[PDB]
Amino acid sequence: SLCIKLLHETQGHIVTMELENGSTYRGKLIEAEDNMNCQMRDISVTARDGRVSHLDQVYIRGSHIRFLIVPDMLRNAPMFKVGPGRSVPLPTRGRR
Amino acid sequence: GTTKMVSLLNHSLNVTTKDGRTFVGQLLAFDGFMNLVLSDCQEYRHEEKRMLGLVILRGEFIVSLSVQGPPPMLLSGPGVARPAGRGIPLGQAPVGLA
Amino acid sequence: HTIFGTGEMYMDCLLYDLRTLYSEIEIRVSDPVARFCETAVDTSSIKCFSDTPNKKNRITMVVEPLEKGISNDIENGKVNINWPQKRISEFFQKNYDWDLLASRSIWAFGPDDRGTNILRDDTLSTDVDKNVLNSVKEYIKQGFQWGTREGPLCDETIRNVNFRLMDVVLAPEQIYRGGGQIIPTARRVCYSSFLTASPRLMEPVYMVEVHAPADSLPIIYDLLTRRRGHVLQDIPRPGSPLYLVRALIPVIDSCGFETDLRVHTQGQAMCQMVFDHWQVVPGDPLDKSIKPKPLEPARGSDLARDFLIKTRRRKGLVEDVSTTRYFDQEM
Amino acid sequence: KAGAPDLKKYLDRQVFVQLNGSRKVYGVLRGYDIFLNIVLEDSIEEKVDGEKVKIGSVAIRGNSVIMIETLDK
Amino acid sequence: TYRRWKLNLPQMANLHRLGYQLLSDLRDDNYFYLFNDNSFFTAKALNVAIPGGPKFEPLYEFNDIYKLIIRHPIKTEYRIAFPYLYNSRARSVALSEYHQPSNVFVPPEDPDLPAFFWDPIINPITSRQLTLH
RNA sequence: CGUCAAAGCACUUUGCAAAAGCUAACGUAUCUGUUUCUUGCCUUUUACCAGAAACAGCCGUUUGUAAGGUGUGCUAAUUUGACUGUAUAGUUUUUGUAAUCUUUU
């Protein structure tokens, strides 16, 4: 599915997100998942209060994520057709 | 199924979420979990606004969907002309008779 | 207009472009030959003597051949001029067992800081007049790195030649010691020590790696041997039914060696040539009793003399090379 | 499904977990799960007061987990 | 109409096996080296002639013996390989395919042993020459 | 295999159009002629020898499209396309940690 591949493509860039917790996190993204796990660095948190903090490394659970906010160049990225028997989108030379 | 959902693709949408917040923008990509991707997004928390950009929502977070606006955006046949003329027929009467 | 390039296939594709892409013109291409180089075999019997045009300075230096273990190290980049003198002297002392004062006294490497030639000090009066010699550092190098880029025999590069500054007579002022009065005489010292030391040509050989079936082998050997070939190794290579046949060949005698393999072994047997080595020509290039005939080829030591006359003939130099007396000073 | 998460780089290192109900824990990461159930040893609470109680070996549930941090680089 | 045909594997097998006495046995192409339609064109253009092949009508100071170095005559085979190099004033010429991979398929003579059986022509595979990390 | 859309379907006869778009077998085949030049063997020109360049014919090939023919179905069969095509109540989305109250501006 495409909504997951877009995420994997923003690895490296800086990302903003929102959790069920209520707080938003901002930082460089290192790894993601099909679950919607994340692995980030140099995070700058900002809760409901406005309280800023620093977190060196973080892992997440996707279940806990509400929504992400992604860089602007990631709208020209390709959105593929996928297929019935494939996990990752990718381009497809073969039959279909 | 998901036949209806492809029809919505590339329309400006109004998406209400479980939090109450409402996101707005075009729809680029769609999922089996209802993960939506949205372009040039704007929340309306309520007399309020914010600019985000590209937003990827989960399925858990989404409540309802609603279209705001519509989707954004044999050379030459044989025939030849001529000028005038309008010949007079000597005979009258129909074509087949005589 | 002599032009260079790695080998047959390379040359073909130049002379294709210039003939049909760049210029749209006909040509008369010559039969291809190798680029030669030149070295010293032994030490010089007579020590050198030289005078400046002003006769205020006298330079003399000895030429000796390097060991083959050393020459390769320089061209690889194991030793530089840019390193400290103490690190460089540790190299020679521990590998080739040089003296302690001899090891520190290295001036600069050969033609354009790579070619295997070395300058060195061999005297005591330099310790007495040290600051006097330090005004004559670059005046030697600019007639040495320029003067050994080209050579005596064919106007070509030089390999494995050491230099040993013995006597240095000097004058009061540094106006008597000028650029125009030292450089063109400092260079003449190298050419004089060559002729006394008995020099010889060296030519490039390249590693021919043949592949083949077992039955074709005998033809490869019989072909190689006629063009001076030393098989370094012959094995049935693993995982595939082919025999490797590594080899060496003197570039002059590999003109179309590839096409004769493929013909005679009927489409079996491929071969490549990768630049390697430098092998000395058997005979002596300065021997008056040799001259044979311009039509037929050479065989043994008589071949070395043959290349020299012919190479100089093409350049437009004096053919005999009898004008050794010009560069040998006077005695 | 069941993408076994990338927690190999956290094994046998200290952590600063956060869980549901704003409760958080320190511990050495021993083992992990498909569903992100965790095994922590030398477990110390961080109470809302700040009073730190030593517990020992503990198995935190996957569902609960909000996040997982590293104290030292 | 009888255009287009599709044949089973076993059928094509028999046809092959019946026709065997006619059709060839090269598979490589390397075999041809100086016997390609290209080579023969250059021969024609250079007016030289190669041994087994055809021979046509012709189509169409600096030298100095004392400047040359006579070392191995240079044959006609050499001109028809690298015509731009070894030969001057080369026009109307065609350049040929320099080498192909080489096929390493020997067909099974004795058809009892299986499809995948280490053949005795391949060299053992021993590796005692090597020095690793 | 599954869905949706289009269409009769397979086989065949003619007509009419095309067939280097980024160096490549419309044809893993291959023949005759004209003109202009060069050489052969020659004196009757034709008929020819064997090279070149420039044009032509002929024997064939493919595709699209139009109308037909035979056999079968138009209460069916076949072809052709298109597609974000799978089924999960027990931890990372669709069988809920929800429900409810109160204070501040």
UniProtKB/Swiss-Prot annotation, chain A:
Residues 2-74 form the Sm domain. It holds the Pfam family LSM. One of its GO terms (biological process) is mRNA cis splicing, via spliceosome. PROSITE patterns: SM (PS52002). One of its GO terms (molecular function) is RNA binding. It is found in: Nucleus; Cytoplasm, Cytosol. InterPro entries: LSm4/Sm_D1/D3 (IPR027141), LSM_dom_sf (IPR010920), Sm (IPR047575), Sm_dom_euk/arc (IPR001163), SmD3 (IPR034099). The keyword Cytoplasm applies. Keywords: Cytoplasm, mRNA processing, mRNA splicing, Nucleus, Ribonucleoprotein, Spliceosome. GO terms for cellular component: catalytic step 2 spliceosome; commitment complex; cytosol; nucleus; post-mRNA release spliceosomal complex; precatalytic spliceosome; SMN-Sm protein complex; spliceosomal complex. Coiled coil: none annotated. It comes from the Eukaryota. Plays a role in pre-mRNA splicing as a core component of the spliceosomal U1, U2, U4 and U5 small nuclear ribonucleoproteins (snRNPs), the building blocks of the spliceosome. Belongs to the 40S cdc5-associated complex (or cwf complex), a spliceosome sub-complex reminiscent of a late-stage spliceosome composed of the U2, U5 and U6 snRNAs and at least brr2, cdc5, cwf2/prp3, cwf3/syf1, cwf4/syf3, cwf5/ecm2, spp42/cwf6, cwf7/spf27, cwf8, cwf9, cwf10, cwf11, cwf12, prp45/cwf13, cwf14, cwf15, cwf16, cwf17, cwf18, cwf19, cwf20, cwf21, cwf22, cwf23, cwf24, cwf25, cwf26, cyp7/cwf27, cwf28, cwf29/ist3, lea1, msl1, prp5/cwf1, prp10, prp12/sap130, prp17, prp22, sap61, sap62, sap114, sap145, slu7, smb1, smd1, smd3, smf1, smg1 and syf2. PANTHER family: SMALL NUCLEAR RIBONUCLEOPROTEIN SM. The gene is smd3.
UniProtKB/Swiss-Prot annotation, chain B:
It comes from the Eukaryota. The keyword Disulfide bond does not apply. One of its GO terms (biological process) is mRNA 5'-splice site recognition. GO terms for molecular function: RNA binding; snRNP binding. The keyword Transmembrane helix does not apply. GO terms for cellular component: catalytic step 2 spliceosome; cytoplasm; cytosol; nucleus; post-mRNA release spliceosomal complex; spliceosomal complex; U1 snRNP; U2 snRNP. This is Small nuclear ribonucleoprotein-associated protein B. The gene is smb1. The chain holds residues 2 to 118 of 147 of the full protein.
Swiss-Prot record, chain C:
It is found in: Cytoplasm; Nucleus. Belongs to the TRAFAC class translation factor GTPase superfamily. Classic translation factor GTPase family. EF-G/EF-2 subfamily. Component of the U5 snRNP complex required for pre-mRNA splicing. Binds GTP. Belongs to the 40S cdc5-associated complex (or cwf complex), a spliceosome sub-complex reminiscent of a late-stage spliceosome composed of the U2, U5 and U6 snRNAs and at least brr2, cdc5, cwf2/prp3, cwf3/syf1, cwf4/syf3, cwf5/ecm2, spp42/cwf6, cwf7/spf27, cwf8, cwf9, cwf10, cwf11, cwf12, prp45/cwf13, cwf14, cwf15, cwf16, cwf17, cwf18, cwf19, cwf20, cwf21, cwf22, cwf23, cwf24, cwf25, cwf26, cyp7/cwf27, cwf28, cwf29/ist3, lea1, msl1, prp5/cwf1, prp10, prp12/sap130, prp17, prp22, sap61, sap62, sap114, sap145, slu7, smb1, smd1, smd3, smf1, smg1 and syf2. This is Pre-mRNA-splicing factor cwf10. It comes from Schizosaccharomyces pombe (strain 972 / ATCC 24843) (Fission yeast). The gene is cwf10. The chain holds residues 641 to 971 of 984 of the full protein.
Swiss-Prot record, chain E:
Transmembrane segments: none annotated. It is found in: Nucleus. Belongs to the 40S cdc5-associated complex (or cwf complex), a spliceosome sub-complex reminiscent of a late-stage spliceosome composed of the U2, U5 and U6 snRNAs and at least brr2, cdc5, cwf2/prp3, cwf3/syf1, cwf4/syf3, cwf5/ecm2, spp42/cwf6, cwf7/spf27, cwf8, cwf9, cwf10, cwf11, cwf12, prp45/cwf13, cwf14, cwf15, cwf16, cwf17, cwf18, cwf19, cwf20, cwf21, cwf22, cwf23, cwf24, cwf25, cwf26, cyp7/cwf27, cwf28, cwf29/ist3, lea1, msl1, prp5/cwf1, prp10, prp12/sap130, prp17, prp22, sap61, sap62, sap114, sap145, slu7, smb1, smd1, smd3, smf1, smg1 and syf2. Interacts with prp1. Involved in pre-mRNA splicing. May be involved in endoplasmic reticulum-associated protein degradation (ERAD) and required for growth at low and high temperatures. Required for pre-spliceosome formation, which is the first step of pre-mRNA splicing. This protein is associated with snRNP U5. Has a role in branch site-3' splice site selection. Associates with the branch site-3' splice 3'-exon region. This is Pre-mRNA-splicing factor spp42. It comes from Schizosaccharomyces pombe (strain 972 / ATCC 24843) (Fission yeast).
